[PDB]
């Protein structure tokens, strides 16, 4: 999909991959296309957890992270259709925003 581009920054183990139903533990920084940061788990020093396949996070996230190795870090560029669409998020994400997430898959649990 051209909707979710995945550029590796640092490789993972290349073998331990998230299966549907596993809790992914990640560190992330989220930015708009201009570079303004809007959320970062690294700034609060607490990793963020979500379960693949529960649709807790935007589709681009589940699609980007599912194809990542434990230990891997990657830049996810996610089109609005894969994220917050026309609506965005009040005061944080504008309408039709392409988002950039710098994401590291720390652990599967």
């Amino acid at each position: 999909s051209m909707g979710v581009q995945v550029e590796t920054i640092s490789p993972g183990d290349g073998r331990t991959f998230p299966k549907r139903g596993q809790t992914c533990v990640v560190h992330y920084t989220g930015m708009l296309e201009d570079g303004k940061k809007f959320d970062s788990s690294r700034d609060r020093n607490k990793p963020f957890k979500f379960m693949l396949g529960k649709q807790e996070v935007i589709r681009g996230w589940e699609e980007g992270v599912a194809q990542m190795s434990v230990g891997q870090r990657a830049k996810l560029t996610i089109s609005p259709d894969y994220a917050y669409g026309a609506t965005g998020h009040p005061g944080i994400i504008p309408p039709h925003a392409t988002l950039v997430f710098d994401v590291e898959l720390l652990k599967l649990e």
Binding site: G30, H89, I92
Partner: protein
């Protein structure tokens, strides 16, 4: 999982009141909606449970999207967070098409609003002043601009009423329902008709000055002081809970009803006689009067009211 701690962890980092975005957008699908608990402008308010904790959820349909937007943006404003402003947690979206629901998720207060709390119990001077002082401290915070690298503008509330103030477990108040709020950077006749000042009722509010909205707020707050004061016992006597103008207009009063009483005849809620026998209630009476003067420019400021109430508090050896 401890919501307060989650909110504290994320606000230490910075910028946004409430949870981090990605966390906010996990919530709608996980909340257990339990029951409707009240009303908000443009949406019902429900109690929900999230990770076993009670929260309040103001629910909008997509026809009122703009209001969800406006209200959520306000709550997410920098330096907005304050013990006398209702605590914002998250905004999220669920459902499908015409049935899409927009959630504004906040702290839940089991005592309910000032309207509920005043119907439920009578007060002494100390509780009366604590409710009045805390409530005006919230208002003053809204009204006051705060300079920073990322500042807070002056904000006028525009829909103040006893139903829009919550009473916390510790006897203090926080202000809610910010969907008609205006920032200093709108239709004149918006809000709850019973609390509209004369200049809002007759559309003579001066739209050239932001200050007009702030002064409008103070009239409305004067009416709330009256509601609260009626419930303070003195000389073994107390009034029953009533809304302002209860004896002069029908429930759900119309513009025509209110214009007649407030704009034309220029009446105001009456003071029970027993107030003149107690210095504190006499002083409360004078404070109300000075809040709800016909001429906006003559009304006390929220800061003045705050300071006056602080002086009453310490004048009876009452802390806060």
């Amino acid at each position: 999982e401890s919501l307060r701690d989650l909110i504290e962890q994320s606000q230490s980092s910075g910028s946004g009141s409430g949870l981090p975005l990605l966390v906010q957008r996990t919530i709608a699908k996980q909340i257990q909606m339990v029951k409707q608990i009240g009303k908000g402008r443009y949406g019902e308010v429900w109690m929900g449970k999230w990770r076993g904790e009670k929260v309040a959820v103001k629910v909008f349909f997509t026809t009122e999207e703009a209001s969800w937007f406006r209200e959520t943006e306000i709550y997410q404003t920098v330096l907005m967070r304050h013990e006398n402003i209702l605590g914002f947690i998250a905004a999220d979206i669920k459902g499908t098409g015409s049935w899409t629901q927009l959630y504004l998720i906040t702290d839940y207060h089991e005592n309910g609003s000032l309207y509920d709390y005043l119907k439920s119990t009578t007060l002494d001077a100390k509780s009366m002043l604590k409710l009045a002082y805390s409530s005006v401290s919230g208002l003053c915070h809204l009204h006051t601009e705060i300079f920073s690298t990322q500042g807070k503008p002056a904000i006028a509330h525009r829909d103040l009423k006893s139903k829009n103030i919550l009473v916390k477990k510790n006897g203090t108040c926080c202000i809610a329902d910010l969907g008609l709020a205006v920032k200093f950077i709108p239709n004149t006749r918006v809000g709850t008709k019973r609390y509209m000042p004369p200049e809002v009722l007759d559309e003579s509010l001066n739209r050239n000055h932001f200050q007009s909205y702030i002064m409008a707020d103070m009239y409305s707050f004067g009416l709330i002081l009256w509601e609260v004061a009626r419930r303070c016992v003195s000389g073994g006597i107390v009034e029953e809970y009533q809304l302002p103008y209860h004896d002069l207009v029908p429930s759900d009063p119309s513009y025509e009803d209110m214009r007649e009483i407030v704009c034309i005849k220029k009446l105001r809620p009456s003071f029970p006689n027993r107030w003149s026998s107690d210095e504190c209630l006499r002083q409360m009476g004078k404070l109300m009067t000075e809040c709800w003067a016909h001429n906006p420019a003559s009304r006390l400021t929220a800061l003045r009211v705050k300071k006056t109430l602080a002086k009453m508090s310490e004048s009876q050896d009452i802390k806060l």
